[PDB]
Amino acid sequence: RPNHTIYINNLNEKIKKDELKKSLHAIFSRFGQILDILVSRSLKMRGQAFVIFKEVSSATNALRSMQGFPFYDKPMRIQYAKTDSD
RNA sequence: CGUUGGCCCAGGAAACUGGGUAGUAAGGUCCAUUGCACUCCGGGCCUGAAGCAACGCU
Fold it and tell me: Which residues form the RRM domain?
């Protein structure tokens, strides 16, 4: 069940928040329009991020073509989210 | 509050960018976490900032 944004985890716990998004935007800017990419470093939200797309088309593509993309030396694990208040 | 300069932290090869003007932001390190959020927030230790000027606006 596809969704505007996507949920990525297995991300590099050690990388700084602001560098992380930039790093991400770069890797996904090509798929469509990013409404926002959400990045937290708390205990619960860490090693994981939500990037929000313009349209559920980019997503499926991002997801299809980017699974296990070795990113900061670690294969990203990508999912469709479940909500996002756009 | 704001704009222009300073100055401090962070990024950068720079130009330039983000933020800020207290044991806090930040730097280092060790443990614990594979974790679904949208107002934020694990723990230990030794380190650890600048904190000005002119002008303008209710």
Answer: 4-83
